[PDB]
Amino acid sequence: GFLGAAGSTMGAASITLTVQARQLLECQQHLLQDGHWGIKQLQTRVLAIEHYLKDQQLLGIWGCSGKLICCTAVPWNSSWSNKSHDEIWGNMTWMQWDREISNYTNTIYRLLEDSQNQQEQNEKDLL
Amino acid sequence: LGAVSFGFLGAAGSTMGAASITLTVQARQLLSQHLLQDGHWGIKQLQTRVLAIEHYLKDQQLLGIWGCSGKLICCTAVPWNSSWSNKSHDEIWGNMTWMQWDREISNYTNTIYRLLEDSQNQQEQNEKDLL
Amino acid sequence: FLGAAGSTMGAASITLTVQARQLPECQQHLLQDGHWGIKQLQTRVLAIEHYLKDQQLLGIWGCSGKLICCTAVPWNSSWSNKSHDEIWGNMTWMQWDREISNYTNTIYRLLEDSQNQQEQNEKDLL
Amino acid sequence: LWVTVYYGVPVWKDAETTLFCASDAKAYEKEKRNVWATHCCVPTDPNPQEMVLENVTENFNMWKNDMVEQMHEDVISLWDQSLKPCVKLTPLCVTLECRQVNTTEEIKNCSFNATTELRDKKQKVYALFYRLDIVPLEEERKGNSSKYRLINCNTSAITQACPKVTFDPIPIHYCAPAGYAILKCNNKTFNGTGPCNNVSTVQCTHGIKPVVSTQLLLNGSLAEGEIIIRSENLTNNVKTIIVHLNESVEIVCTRPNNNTVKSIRIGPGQWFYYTGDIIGNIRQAYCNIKKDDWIRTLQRVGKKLAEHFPRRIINFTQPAGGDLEITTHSFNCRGEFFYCNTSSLFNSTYNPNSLDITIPCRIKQIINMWQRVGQAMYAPPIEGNITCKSNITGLLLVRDGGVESNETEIFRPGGGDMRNNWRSELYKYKVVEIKPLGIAPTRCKRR
Amino acid sequence: LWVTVYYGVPVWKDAETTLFCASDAKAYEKEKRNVWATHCCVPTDPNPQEMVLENVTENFNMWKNDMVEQMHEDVISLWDQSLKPCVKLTPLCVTLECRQVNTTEEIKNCSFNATTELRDKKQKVYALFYRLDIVPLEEERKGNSSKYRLINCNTSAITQACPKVTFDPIPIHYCAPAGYAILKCNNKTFNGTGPCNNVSTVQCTHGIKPVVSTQLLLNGSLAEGEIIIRSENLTNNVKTIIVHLNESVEIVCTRPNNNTVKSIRIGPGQWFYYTGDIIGNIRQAYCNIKKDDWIRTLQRVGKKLAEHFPRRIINFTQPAGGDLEITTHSFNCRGEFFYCNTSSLFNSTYNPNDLDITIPCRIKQIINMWQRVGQAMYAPPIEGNITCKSNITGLLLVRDGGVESNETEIFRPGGGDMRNNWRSELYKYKVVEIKPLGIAPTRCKRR
Amino acid sequence: LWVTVYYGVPVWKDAETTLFCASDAKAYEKEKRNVWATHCCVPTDPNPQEMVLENVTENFNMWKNDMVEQMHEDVISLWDQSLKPCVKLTPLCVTLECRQVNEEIKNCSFNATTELRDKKQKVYALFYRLDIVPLEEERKGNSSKYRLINCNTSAITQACPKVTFDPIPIHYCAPAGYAILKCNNKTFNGTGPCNNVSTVQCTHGIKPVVSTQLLLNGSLAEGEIIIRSENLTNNVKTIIVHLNESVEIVCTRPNNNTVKSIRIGPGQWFYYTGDIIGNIRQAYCNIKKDDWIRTLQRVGKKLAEHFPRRIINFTQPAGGDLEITTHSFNCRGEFFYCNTSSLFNSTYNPNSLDITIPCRIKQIINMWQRVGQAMYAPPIEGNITCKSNITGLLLVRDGESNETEIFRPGGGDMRNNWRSELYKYKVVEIKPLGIAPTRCKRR
Ligand SMILES: *[C@@H]1O[C@H](CO)[C@@H](O[C@@H]2O[C@H](CO)[C@@H](O[C@@H]3O[C@H](CO[C@H]4O[C@H](CO)[C@@H](O)[C@H](O)[C@@H]4O)[C@@H](O)[C@H](O[C@H]4O[C@H](CO)[C@@H](O)[C@H](O)[C@@H]4O)[C@@H]3O)[C@H](O)[C@H]2NC(C)=O)[C@H](O)[C@H]1NC(C)=O
Ligand SMILES: *[C@@H]1O[C@H](CO)[C@@H](O[C@@H]2O[C@H](CO)[C@@H](O[C@@H]3O[C@H](CO[C@H]4O[C@H](CO)[C@@H](O)[C@H](O)[C@@H]4O)[C@@H](O)[C@H](O[C@H]4O[C@H](CO)[C@@H](O)[C@H](O)[C@@H]4O)[C@@H]3O)[C@H](O)[C@H]2NC(C)=O)[C@H](O)[C@H]1NC(C)=O
Ligand SMILES: *[C@@H]1O[C@H](CO)[C@@H](O[C@@H]2O[C@H](CO)[C@@H](O[C@@H]3O[C@H](CO[C@H]4O[C@H](CO)[C@@H](O)[C@H](O)[C@@H]4O)[C@@H](O)[C@H](O[C@H]4O[C@H](CO)[C@@H](O)[C@H](O)[C@@H]4O)[C@@H]3O)[C@H](O)[C@H]2NC(C)=O)[C@H](O)[C@H]1NC(C)=O
Ligand SMILES: *[C@@H]1O[C@H](CO)[C@@H](O[C@@H]2O[C@H](CO)[C@@H](O)[C@H](O)[C@H]2NC(C)=O)[C@H](O)[C@H]1NC(C)=O
Ligand SMILES: *[C@@H]1O[C@H](CO)[C@@H](O[C@@H]2O[C@H](CO)[C@@H](O)[C@H](O)[C@H]2NC(C)=O)[C@H](O)[C@H]1NC(C)=O
Ligand SMILES: *[C@@H]1O[C@H](CO)[C@@H](O)[C@H](O)[C@H]1NC(C)=O
Ligand SMILES: *[C@@H]1O[C@H](CO)[C@@H](O)[C@H](O)[C@H]1NC(C)=O
Ligand SMILES: *[C@@H]1O[C@H](CO)[C@@H](O)[C@H](O)[C@H]1NC(C)=O
Ligand SMILES: *[C@@H]1O[C@H](CO)[C@@H](O)[C@H](O)[C@H]1NC(C)=O
Numbered sequence A: 001g002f003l004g005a006a007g008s009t010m011g012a013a014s015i016t017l018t019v020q021a022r023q024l025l026e027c028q029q030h031l032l033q034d035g036h037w038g039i040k041q042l043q044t045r046v047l048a049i050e051h052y053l054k055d056q057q058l059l060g061i062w063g064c065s066g067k068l069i070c071c072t073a074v075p076w077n078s079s080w081s082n083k084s085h086d087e088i089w090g091n092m093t094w095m096q097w098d099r100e101i102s103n104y105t106n107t108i109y110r111l112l113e114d115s116q117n118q119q120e121q122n123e124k125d126l127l
Numbered sequence B: 001l002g003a004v005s006f007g008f009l010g011a012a013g014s015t016m017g018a019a020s021i022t023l024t025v026q027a028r029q030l031l032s033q034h035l036l037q038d039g040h041w042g043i044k045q046l047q048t049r050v051l052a053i054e055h056y057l058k059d060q061q062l063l064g065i066w067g068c069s070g071k072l073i074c075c076t077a078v079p080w081n082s083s084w085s086n087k088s089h090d091e092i093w094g095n096m097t098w099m100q101w102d103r104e105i106s107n108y109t110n111t112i113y114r115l116l117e118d119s120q121n122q123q124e125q126n127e128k129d130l131l
Numbered sequence C: 001f002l003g004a005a006g007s008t009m010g011a012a013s014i015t016l017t018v019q020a021r022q023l024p025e026c027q028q029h030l031l032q033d034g035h036w037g038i039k040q041l042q043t044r045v046l047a048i049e050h051y052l053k054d055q056q057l058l059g060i061w062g063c064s065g066k067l068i069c070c071t072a073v074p075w076n077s078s079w080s081n082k083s084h085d086e087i088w089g090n091m092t093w094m095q096w097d098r099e100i101s102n103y104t105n106t107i108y109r110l111l112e113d114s115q116n117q118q119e120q121n122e123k124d125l126l
Numbered sequence D: 001l002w003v004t005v006y007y008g009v010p011v012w013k014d015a016e017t018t019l020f021c022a023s024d025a026k027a028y029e030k031e032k033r034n035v036w037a038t039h040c041c042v043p044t045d046p047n048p049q050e051m052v053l054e055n056v057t058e059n060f061n062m063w064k065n066d067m068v069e070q071m072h073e074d075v076i077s078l079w080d081q082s083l084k085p086c087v088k089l090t091p092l093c094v095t096l097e098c099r100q101v102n103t104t105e106e107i108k109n110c111s112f113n114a115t116t117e118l119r120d121k122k123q124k125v126y127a128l129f130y131r132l133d134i135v136p137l138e139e140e141r142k143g144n145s146s147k148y149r150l151i152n153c154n155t156s157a158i159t160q161a162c163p164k165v166t167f168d169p170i171p172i173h174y175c176a177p178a179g180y181a182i183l184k185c186n187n188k189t190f191n192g193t194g195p196c197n198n199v200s201t202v203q204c205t206h207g208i209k210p211v212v213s214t215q216l217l218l219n220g221s222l223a224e225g226e227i228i229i230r231s232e233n234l235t236n237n238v239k240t241i242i243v244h245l246n247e248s249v250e251i252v253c254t255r256p257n258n259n260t261v262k263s264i265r266i267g268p269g270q271w272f273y274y275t276g277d278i279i280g281n282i283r284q285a286y287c288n289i290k291k292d293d294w295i296r297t298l299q300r301v302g303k304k305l306a307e308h309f310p311r312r313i314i315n316f317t318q319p320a321g322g323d324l325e326i327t328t329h330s331f332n333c334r335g336e337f338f339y340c341n342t343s344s345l346f347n348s349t350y351n352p353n354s355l356d357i358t359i360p361c362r363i364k365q366i367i368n369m370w371q372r373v374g375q376a377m378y379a380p381p382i383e384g385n386i387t388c389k390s391n392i393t394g395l396l397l398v399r400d401g402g403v404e405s406n407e408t409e410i411f412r413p414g415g416g417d418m419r420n421n422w423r424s425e426l427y428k429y430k431v432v433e434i435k436p437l438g439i440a441p442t443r444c445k446r447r
Numbered sequence E: 001l002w003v004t005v006y007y008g009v010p011v012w013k014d015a016e017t018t019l020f021c022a023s024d025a026k027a028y029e030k031e032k033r034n035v036w037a038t039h040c041c042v043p044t045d046p047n048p049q050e051m052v053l054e055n056v057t058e059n060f061n062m063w064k065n066d067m068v069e070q071m072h073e074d075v076i077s078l079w080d081q082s083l084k085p086c087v088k089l090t091p092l093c094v095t096l097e098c099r100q101v102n103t104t105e106e107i108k109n110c111s112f113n114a115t116t117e118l119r120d121k122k123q124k125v126y127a128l129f130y131r132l133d134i135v136p137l138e139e140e141r142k143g144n145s146s147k148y149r150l151i152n153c154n155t156s157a158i159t160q161a162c163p164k165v166t167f168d169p170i171p172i173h174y175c176a177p178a179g180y181a182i183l184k185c186n187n188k189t190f191n192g193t194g195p196c197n198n199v200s201t202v203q204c205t206h207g208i209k210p211v212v213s214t215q216l217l218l219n220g221s222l223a224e225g226e227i228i229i230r231s232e233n234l235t236n237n238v239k240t241i242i243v244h245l246n247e248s249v250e251i252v253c254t255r256p257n258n259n260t261v262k263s264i265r266i267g268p269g270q271w272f273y274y275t276g277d278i279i280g281n282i283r284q285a286y287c288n289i290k291k292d293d294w295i296r297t298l299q300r301v302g303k304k305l306a307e308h309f310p311r312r313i314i315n316f317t318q319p320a321g322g323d324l325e326i327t328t329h330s331f332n333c334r335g336e337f338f339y340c341n342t343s344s345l346f347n348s349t350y351n352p353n354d355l356d357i358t359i360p361c362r363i364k365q366i367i368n369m370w371q372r373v374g375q376a377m378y379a380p381p382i383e384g385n386i387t388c389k390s391n392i393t394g395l396l397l398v399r400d401g402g403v404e405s406n407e408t409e410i411f412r413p414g415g416g417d418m419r420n421n422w423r424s425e426l427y428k429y430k431v432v433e434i435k436p437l438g439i440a441p442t443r444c445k446r447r
Numbered sequence F: 001l002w003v004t005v006y007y008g009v010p011v012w013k014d015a016e017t018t019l020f021c022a023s024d025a026k027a028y029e030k031e032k033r034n035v036w037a038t039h040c041c042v043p044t045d046p047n048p049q050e051m052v053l054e055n056v057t058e059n060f061n062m063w064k065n066d067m068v069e070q071m072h073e074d075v076i077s078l079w080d081q082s083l084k085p086c087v088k089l090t091p092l093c094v095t096l097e098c099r100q101v102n103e104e105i106k107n108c109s110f111n112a113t114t115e116l117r118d119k120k121q122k123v124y125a126l127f128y129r130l131d132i133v134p135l136e137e138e139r140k141g142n143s144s145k146y147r148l149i150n151c152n153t154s155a156i157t158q159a160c161p162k163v164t165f166d167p168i169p170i171h172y173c174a175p176a177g178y179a180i181l182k183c184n185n186k187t188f189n190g191t192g193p194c195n196n197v198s199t200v201q202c203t204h205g206i207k208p209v210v211s212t213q214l215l216l217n218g219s220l221a222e223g224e225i226i227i228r229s230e231n232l233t234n235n236v237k238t239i240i241v242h243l244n245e246s247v248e249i250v251c252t253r254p255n256n257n258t259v260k261s262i263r264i265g266p267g268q269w270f271y272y273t274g275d276i277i278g279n280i281r282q283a284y285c286n287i288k289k290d291d292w293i294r295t296l297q298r299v300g301k302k303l304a305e306h307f308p309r310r311i312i313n314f315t316q317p318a319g320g321d322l323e324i325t326t327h328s329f330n331c332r333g334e335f336f337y338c339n340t341s342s343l344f345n346s347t348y349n350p351n352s353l354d355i356t357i358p359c360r361i362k363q364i365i366n367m368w369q370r371v372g373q374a375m376y377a378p379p380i381e382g383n384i385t386c387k388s389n390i391t392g393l394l395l396v397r398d399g400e401s402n403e404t405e406i407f408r409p410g411g412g413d414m415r416n417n418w419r420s421e422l423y424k425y426k427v428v429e430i431k432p433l434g435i436a437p438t439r440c441k442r443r
């Protein structure tokens, strides 16, 4: 429970996030013994680790690893959202925006992957 | 997860050149209970999942040690020693397959890993000369 | 592998080997017997959790992938008034760690803010 | 103009994870003889926060909430584990010779030949068993004793509840794991489903007592607002109706019998406790409830039901006859399992268009909890008379009226499904998974 | 000219790992109460992916395959888990007084004193036991009653199979975990070991039915080409020879008796099912095989063996003497365990050099599975008469290896080791682990 | 001048983690196996790596060491797992009837069960008087009725004859990310800094032996005799003594003790002592006299040094139950109980031959004072004899007195036996991430 600035404007939410995102970082005698609780706790922890590493892998594929805000080279296409700038970042919440562009996430991911392939080719061409 | 999808295989048929061409084009697309707690099954599934995570993290750490993290293909500073394999460069890529090449230099892997570590360590030493 | 423990922080050469430092069917009966499998899994998962916490804490500071990384945080006399000549060559890593044990949170916060400033500069520049 | 990837975005999705129990360590982990204290050992932090989310509307639904299923499974598992190491009373299921006159019928002076630590020796025993706990083999003849057997001996083995272990409820908190959060709706008039306009995120739920009852919810949490009626589909009369009271009502129940508890050894390190003797007269167990408060509460509930069921006459009545498990207000009172005939309470009529009510109650020892046919437990008696006070905070109502006679609606006590009890406490919560990755356009690019 | 690191390289190595079990997508069934359905709940992928590796050769070896060991252990664990929460027949191991059946000596009419839920009471029971499942204590006298016991009581206890659970071998699929792949050798006429010139990669194997049989493999998959012979070392006479056919020979089996099943209560909620009476005349169980198909199949197998064993006469004589469990064709039909004497089948010799067959079959209720001394199970009978039809797809032959035989080789039926069946079904599969990291030289350097 | 983040710093913090047991590759032959071999299935590296920490001083504390708790729980769990699938002798708790054989032994007879539940078999067995309770007054006119001991307490489990509990040297190894520090300084007492420390992935071979008064195996002290105790002034804290030279002790049970077996249930076998051949003789232990006297003299000198201006008095253990007053141990499954009064009969002065110690035998045991559990040790044919090296003693100072300190054997708590071996070791977790200033900015 650390959903700071949830439901506020996307711009205000991002301005808050620039500071907030950097804030990251005898039961066993009874629990985890003579019952199914050990397996459940291990499953929860392993699932959390799996999701964390999947997110970090997905960031790495786009070349955005090690960043919280990473600008990309993919040009935004208007077909994904008829609203323009300052209407998304003003008078709109993060949840509303995510529900608005839920459908095009796969397309955006494919474009990001192609972009990163081209960036790697440019870097190899730099040598 | 890491590189685990079967789409990475299938290129094993072609030579090293074609497999390399397939990478950088299809690599990133491919990268993308009732009896639970009833029998050892649960412990076995947890063991398998933790082993998969450990293998993935070890490979990522090993890439990071060489400075190749975040890249599918990274060019290093280590020169290629003819003693490991004197095969022609064109012969290596145009002909042969990644399986055959792996079989050829299986026993020299540790030496190349140590050389890569030394090279990246020297690169870090050079970066210390900021001023 | 506590190489050169108590070496008066003379690990300018010792730490350079840290890069190399980083690199039974009968036994499987125990995994399906008693609770030794549970304890082994807990130890494995705890080790993975600590390693990932350290890696994330390196990533947040922007020092990802570096055995040694310089930062933009300037050293303050409040933490320790010992010159670098005394710290390097006399004080051991254990003694140094005890010296600034209570100031760790402040240094972490300053590192976080410095890296955030670096990201803001990069974003507004590009 | 350009895509940009944001991490740490405050976006969540509906999800289902395995919550971990947490409870106050102080004054509960001192001795750890309680089941709920030995389990749920995670100490709760002092003063958990409530990050209020301004201008957020979230779609709640108390029914089809996985938290209720988790709590039900946890309670079942904990009771099973508590009974798991205790003694089995399978040796005691023998022919039971009983005399209806236990000197000076609810209780019978029964005798049997139990086993002992020595296999070739049998201990002759006399014990006072409640008539509900016994079924006959021979049709009873008043002129002499008759042969009986324990109830649910042909069905399953009887596992005595350990005398050292106590099932007294304590306030336990459910807490979400890392990477998840619990949303609490603070509307104060939330009708059980649909959007809620006042949500706040918490790491742990408020204190919940896992109470066991069938008709009247006890020791719960009073609603902030007025009396709230909740039901999945009020048109569907089959579904149970949950009522939260904004004012508690006091209920006091007592077993006025001065029992003496004798113990015998059945096997190696295996004791067995039974009602050795009764001192003084024998009086039924009864419950007292405040009359004025109860009448006012029933009037207000009738008003609310008439509002939800306009153009009708609201009638409260006793439940239709049947099994004791479903037609009586059952509960646990210091280890004794009561069963109360609440006909005298649900007798009033519709809302118009000092003194206390005495309720008779029966007590059993051999319990078949949660309708789990094939399992049973024997609750040993306790020396001295028993008293216990409780706060009635809710009612479980079932709407009848299939005939649709006149313009009269009939409500009866519900029960039989324990999930309703915990849904009455977990209605306001919802588990959500954070999805920190997010994308939005902006003006700056890689360059 | 310079080292370069590649990720995602298509390189694999042999490895051993746990394999998931997955059933058909929805399995056309719900609440099947089947062991294979309760486990293997993971639904397989409809339209499974398969990819062909062009110009790739892999050294398969069906022997020394860990998948066989994993499947064997999984089958044993499944059976143990299924039998564990079922009725124990320790009470029934008592002195049985059996006499000749009151017909108007395979079966005997046995009477005994079984226990009841009440310890003091004992129940007189009459039941029909097959003579195989009983061992005498007194030699027969005058045709009257004599004492008997259940077999295997002196060795270990007996666990009745739960009647509600069924062991129908529905197909299952072994799916490899993440990071691993299963290589399937597409080349027909693959002789068990050595390279395979056409391979493909699959998440899960084809649908495999875990059938239990000794002499004849039943309901298996058919060979693509002609008959295939496989053996670890054909020169060695000890190693079993797996004959895998390219055509199916139908076999029909049936128990003609009309059973009357009557049950009793031995303990609390402990039932026991037995054959109370047989209606009509008593007849021996039998199996039927079409004579023409069997003769053609044996002739083709003899031809193939002659090709592998030139200048010798192939015999196919009867099994060597021994116990019933190893010298006969055992299998399961609706929980009834058959034991068929296949001597009338393996009778004809084939000479390269120079209308159905009826088979009597015995029935047993007390079983020892996988030769595990110290465990047993009691398969309950079924009212009415049983019929079942199966496809004989493979044979298990043991070569006699007669020293200095008169240009003759004798191949008796094999069996006794259940791993051979799943090795016959899992002959084409191999598990490999991907090793995506790789190094190769190129021209572009770090700079 | 500027902060700088170093990774891989050699710094550790005191920590607690679940160590895993490791043993030699040829731990035991797989035919009969051993509980310690079926467990500890991790081959150990021969000649374990030892990185001596130059100029490193570290704090140790043998007490308040979690390794002791882990070993204690591991031993308890291993024994429970080993005895879990064995035979239950609950059927045998019946009214026994016993007579004289021709004092310790009694010719007991009883009606045991059979595989058939409607049949019984008469059994004649020789039971030790210690394991048999006088159900009647024991008038012994001709015979008398008894029962098995602890039957009213808890069920009795037979130790599986196929499995052996003989100890073997087992090594404890730390998991990944942790290390074990071994204090190599001679004559170092616990609860103090140690200057000679070294890092090892695994401990030396530790024999998990069970005894109450004398440590019958283990490692001898490097230098001289060493005294260790948590307080050494509070009389409740047990004192542990490490000997720098061993003392031979040979123990035996001079009886034939023919073994017979019967079936008490389906697949259930029970073994008993049947009859005997030759005379009835008591078990005893021969311990060398000169070595014992010299060792006690040296220990008296050391205690006098730690307790100046007093007379070091060694006294037999105070009166009490056999489980707490005798020197207990386990030779080939037989549980001995020796008086050992004669060994502690000497007073130290502040200003060829052997000692024979009579010993009793018990078959029914209650190990580690776990009331509510018990086990039955089956007998073995032939006369048993075993040899061992007394490496240490456990002494309890009585603590008023006329210039005299009274030292008695005791310390029946089993944690002390393993603390006496694990005192050298301490488990630590490595914290590789570290920070220090330098002379360079990030730019
Ligand atoms: C709703 O909440 C009310 C309380 O507000 C409950 O009423 C109480 O119920 C509890 C449990 O039955 C009663 O506690 C019992 O008291 C017995 C008498 O002891 C008294 O004196 C001791 C002195 O130390 C006090 O600690 C104790 O509280 C009493 O005042 C005890 O003999 C009982 O012991 C049982 O529980 C313990 C727990 O550790 C076990 O160890 C024992 O073996 C045994 O099982 C018990 O402590 C309390 O007296 C009642 N008070 C009232 C208000 O009457 C309702 O029952 C509850 N109803 C629900 C669940 O909805
Ligand atoms: C190789 O493969 C063949 C074919 O699958 C197997 O032979 C079959 O074996 C199965 C049992 O595993 C047989 O199935 C049984 O058929 C009985 C007869 O069918 C009647 O009943 C059904 C409804 O149940 C009607 O639809 C139909 O018209 C008939 O009236 C059923 O009575 C059996 O059901 C019994 O068990 C179920 C629980 O599982 C109970 O609910 C039922 O009440 C009842 O007690 C069952 O469905 C099948 O008939 C066999 N077919 C053939 C070809 O003979 C071989 O066994 C297999 N290989 C080997 C050796 O195992
Ligand atoms: C402290 O440490 C010492 C040394 O380990 C212990 O004393 C030892 O106790 C064991 C007890 O078994 C003694 O071993 C016995 O030796 C007998 C003679 O050995 C011959 O026969 C065996 C095979 O039986 C051959 O392997 C050997 O080479 C000789 O040919 C054997 O007859 C005994 O075997 C019987 O018991 C064992 C128990 O494991 C069974 O496995 C066998 O099958 C058989 O039934 C047995 O091997 C050993 O000799 C003693 N050593 C010393 C120093 O004398 C102490 O017991 C220990 N501390 C205490 C007191 O507990
Ligand atoms: C064990 O050694 C420690 C020192 O490491 C002792 O602690 C102190 O030791 C000094 C002598 O070096 C004494 O003068 C102090 O009186 C000791 N204080 C304490 C804590 O008692 C400790 O006493 C020693 N204990 C034993 C039993 O030898
Ligand atoms: C061992 O033998 C010794 C020596 O006899 C016993 O010690 C005697 O105990 C009694 C108890 O009442 C005392 O009265 C005697 O004074 C003690 N010594 C003598 C001289 O007999 C001891 O009881 C026996 N116990 C053990 C454990 O062996
Ligand atoms: C190649 O490896 C051999 C191995 O000893 C070494 O002697 C030689 O110097 C190496 N040459 C180059 C160019 O790396
Ligand atoms: C409760 O309110 C919601 C608001 O959406 C409505 O959909 C639902 O039908 C109401 N149910 C009741 C109990 O009246
Ligand atoms: C509570 O819910 C009702 C539903 O009609 C709504 O009108 C009201 O504004 C809500 N108030 C709060 C506190 O969210
Ligand atoms: C509620 O029950 C009535 C009964 O007639 C039914 O018609 C209606 O569709 C149900 N609606 C819901 C919310 O399930």
Ligand SMILES: *[C@@H]1O[C@H](CO)[C@@H](O)[C@H](O)[C@H]1NC(C)=O
Binding pocket: F252, F253, F254, F255, F382, F383
């Ligand atoms: C034990 O038996 C052996 C058999 O050789 C014998 O040599 C030895 O002296 C006997 N010892 C005792 C004390 O019985």
Ligand SMILES: *[C@@H]1O[C@H](CO)[C@@H](O)[C@H](O)[C@H]1NC(C)=O
Binding pocket: F313, F314, F315, F345, F346, F347, F402, F404, F406
């Ligand atoms: C001290 O030991 C001697 C040994 O002979 C004994 O006589 C004396 O009574 C003992 N005194 C005390 C107080 O222990």
